[PDB]
Design a protein around this ligand. Structure first.
Ligand code: IZ3
Ligand code: MG
Length: 296
């Protein structure tokens, strides 16, 4: 894998390679997303979930949410990728989290980035001020938070007001990944990813983890591609066999535009190559990653 990386670097072909992927990517209808009644449920007019893989809310009125089920058969892991919720779709977001039985939510953006709103404040910032989503009959409370230098992990309590059932939802918020950009380092990215993994959130016993950024395709796609490739390396009898470009095209069958710049693609290669060290056994790389990430 690093041989291909090295030759892409020498040839200076990241852009051409990335554009080939965009050209070969699947094109499926998004008719439900484009219905006039769903216009205000979409943050961006050009980013819509394909009809075949969209997540359907269990409400009869309108079951539409800009969210997609990325089901990776060989890796044996599913993820739900969605846009940052809008002021009017936060209830829908939590209804999806509840109905799909997700245990973790991975957020890779900030509410405001460079002077622009990118996502509604869909969770409580203060313990004493819980949130009620009236349209969906759900209550959400901030139980605690572990704030790190570049990411924060939060314990949220989500309650179905109707049945009184409550669930602990873990929120993994990466706060320093710029839009259309990349993480500070493979180490910082991997330190975070393994925190999500170690939490049990990605376990097949739970529903799919919900991953989102602003549009739910650039940063979210980078995060899922690296996680999936590392999973495939650990699975197969020969990790060198993992073709990251093939994996990305496979993921793009479930949601459009995953990975938004040639450099996020190049970063994905670095993340997988670095993470592979842990998969192949190295028990000193993780601490290395933590030290390198300066999470304190
Ligand atoms: O690293 C990233 C990129 C962010 C991001 C990606 C796409 C968009 C959608 C934008 N839509 S628009 O209505 O603001 C907009 C802005 C400029 C030109 C244009 F035609 C529309 C967007 N579209 C292109 C990107 C693009 C191009 C073709 C098809 C689908 C696309 F998403 C660039 N930004 C917003 C944020 S993320 O939150 O997914 N992580
Ligand atoms: Mg306080």
């Amino acid at each position: 894998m690093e041989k291909e990386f090295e030759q892409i670097d020498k040839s200076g072909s990241w852009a051409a390679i990335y554009q080939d992927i965009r050209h070969e990517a699947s094109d499926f209808p998004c008719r439900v997303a484009k219905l006039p009644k769903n216009k205000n449920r979409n943050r961006y007019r050009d980013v819509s979930p394909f009809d075949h893989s969209r997540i359907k809310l269990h409400q009869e009125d309108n079951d539409y949410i800009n969210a997609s089920l990325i089901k990776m058969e060989e890796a044996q892991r599913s993820y739900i990728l969605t846009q940052g919720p809008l002021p009017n779709t936060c209830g829908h977001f939590w209804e999806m989290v509840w109905e799909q039985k997700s245990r973790g939510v991975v957020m890779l953006n900030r509410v405001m980035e460079k002077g622009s709103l990118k996502c509604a404040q869909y969770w409580p910032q203060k313990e004493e001020k819980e949130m009620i989503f009236e349209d969906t009959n759900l209550k959400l409370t901030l139980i605690s938070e572990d704030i790190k230098s570049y990411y924060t992990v939060r314990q949220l309590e989500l309650e179905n007001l109707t049945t009184q059932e409550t669930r602990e939802i873990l929120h993994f918020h990466y706060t320093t990944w710029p839009d259309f950009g990349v993480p500070e380092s493979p180490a910082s990215f991997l330190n975070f990813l393994f925190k999500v993994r170690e939490s049990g959130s990605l376990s097949p016993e739970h529903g799919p983890v919900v991953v989102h950024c602003s549009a739910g395709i650039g940063r979210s796609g980078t995060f899922c591609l690296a996680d999936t490739c590392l999973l495939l390396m650990d699975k197969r009898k020969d990790p060198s066999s993992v073709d990251i470009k093939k994996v990305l095209l496979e993921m793009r069958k479930f949601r459009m535009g995953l990975i938004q710049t040639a450099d996020q693609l190049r970063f994905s290669y670095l993340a997988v190559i670095e993470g592979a060290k842990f998969i192949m056994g190295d028990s000193s790389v993780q601490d290395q990653w933590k030290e390198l990430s300066h999470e304190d």
